């Protein structure tokens, strides 16, 4: 019951009376579940964790199993030090044993607890896996139709599975990922918004790594569903779906092509103008890795009408987004055909590119100077350098370039002078 002192909780838990122990454990749970500043450290210092862990095994008193599971879940929701206290008390195998509880609310609470422990970081994630958590977790989801499961239960299962997919140095064990993926792909087709969001997060973590990890995911055929979720009205779904798509196009040309083949580029007029600045940034970053691809992939960018959207972002966007756009342009001009590059200029890339040369940011200045060099090399292939030179002078570009001559950074000077020397002298 309500607002016990820690002193009274300890007295109750130290009684040799299981019903007294239950009342005291519920009182601890309520303290730990209040809105403001749960006294986690006070409960830890009182030495209560080993008793709570012992209560997880009291099969004939399912209420104290539930109450201690909740209390421990909330201690483990805290700092790494607080999560470690729960693990140090032997809680991981006790919670795994509760996954097979005939009481659904107790099984669910154990799922949640293991999610908190795994969510601490890669070491505790891997320790939860070594204790054998994955088989019984997946067994709870081995049903013909996920819709027969309680919505809250299914959401907790999905979230906990996503933490087993989360974090790097190291990434999760390859065999654990393979074991989880088929269930994860089913969750990715479930019609609940929170299950969809957490499934996308899981996929985004799994694709955040070397191309071999990306391939494990792409082979399971998820890209079309990711592209569908790219267009969800829910921002909590779009954000991780976009991260996952973005991760995939950091991969091989073939992996990138799967994204293009599933129709992803048709969603980018909206993504590149999205009111959430983080979405615009991630979408432009994604575009920059696609224009880093083959000439036929650059051509698909052109065919979907996306070069004017890059011109737009270069013209006006949050500065970090403009940066990604500069990179998209330098990549485009690096790998593209002469005709592709010419098309870029006709779309109006030069003036907004020149205006960003005012940036008090060294990296983007280098990136922009590189693109200009690239565009000049295409123009002389057509023997039209002065024509481009004129365009740069008129919009004030030449002024900035000969300003970048007095610049502090090595490579910026050399790039600036060489431009002046070859095309403006």
């Amino acid at each position: 019951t309500v607002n016990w002192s820690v002193e009274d909780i300890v007295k109750g838990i130290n009684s040799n009376n299981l019903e007294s122990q239950l009342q005291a454990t519920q009182a601890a749970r309520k303290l730990l579940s209040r809105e403001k500043q749960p006294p986690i450290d006070n409960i830890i210092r009182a030495g209560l964790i080993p008793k709570f862990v012992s209560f997880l095994g009291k099969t004939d008193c399912s209420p104290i199993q539930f109450e201690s599971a909740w209390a421990l879940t909330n201690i483990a929701s805290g700092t790494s030090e607080q999560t470690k206290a729960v693990v140090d008390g032997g809680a991981i195998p006790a919670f795994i044993s509760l996954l097979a509880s005939p009481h659904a609310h107790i099984s669910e609470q154990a799922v949640w607890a293991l999610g908190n422990i795994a969510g601490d970081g890669s070491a505790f994630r891997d320790l939860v896996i070594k204790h054998g958590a994955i088989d019984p977790l997946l067994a709870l989801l081995a049903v013909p139709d996920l819709s027969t499961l309680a919505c809250g239960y299914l959401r907790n299962l999905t979230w906990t599975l996503s933490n087993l997919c989360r974090n790097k140095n190291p990434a999760p064990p390859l065999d654990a990922v393979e074991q989880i993926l088929p269930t994860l792909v089913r969750l990715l087709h479930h019609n609940d918004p929170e299950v969809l969001a957490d499934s996308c997060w899981a996929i985004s973590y799994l694709t955040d790594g070397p191309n071999e990890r990306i391939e494990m995911v792409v082979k399971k055929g998820v890209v079309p569903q990711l592209v569908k979720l790219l267009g969800a009205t829910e921002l909590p779904i779009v954000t991780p779906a976009l991260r996952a798509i973005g991760n995939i196009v950091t991969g091989t040309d073939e992996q990138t092509q799967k994204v293009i083949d599933a129709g992803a580029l048709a969603v980018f007029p909206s993504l590149l103008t999205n009111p959430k600045t983080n979405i615009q940034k991630e979408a432009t970053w994604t575009m920059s890795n696609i224009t880093a691809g083959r000439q036929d992939q650059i051509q698909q960018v052109v065919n979907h009408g996306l070069v004017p959207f890059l011109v737009g972002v270069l013209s006006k966007a949050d500065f970090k987004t403009q940066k990604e756009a500069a990179w998209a342009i330098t990549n485009y001009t690096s790998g593209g055909t002469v005709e592709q590059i010419v098309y870029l200029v006709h779309c109006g890339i030069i003036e907004p590119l020149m205006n960003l040369l005012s940036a008090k940011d060294t990296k983007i200045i280098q990136v922009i100077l590189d693109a200009i060099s690239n565009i000049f090399q295409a123009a002389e292939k057509l023997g039209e350098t002065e024509k481009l030179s004129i365009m740069i002078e008129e919009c004030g570009g030449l002024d900035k370039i000969e300003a970048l001559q007095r610049h502090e950074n090595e490579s910026v000077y050399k790039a600036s002078l060489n431009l002046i020397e070859k095309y403006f002298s």
């Binding site: 749970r29 909740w70 909330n74 609470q109 969510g119 997060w201 954000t239 950091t250 983080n278």
Partner: peptide, 27 residues
């Protein structure tokens, strides 16, 4: 070439991300 996802000083979740831990409320 391809830029793999980067570490910005605060851009792991960057507050638009997924909760790695959750406390159960109502008591």
């Amino acid at each position: 070439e391809k830029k793999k996802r980067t570490v910005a000083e605060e851009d792991q979740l960057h507050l638009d991300g997924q909760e790695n831990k959750r406390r159960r409320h109502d008591s």
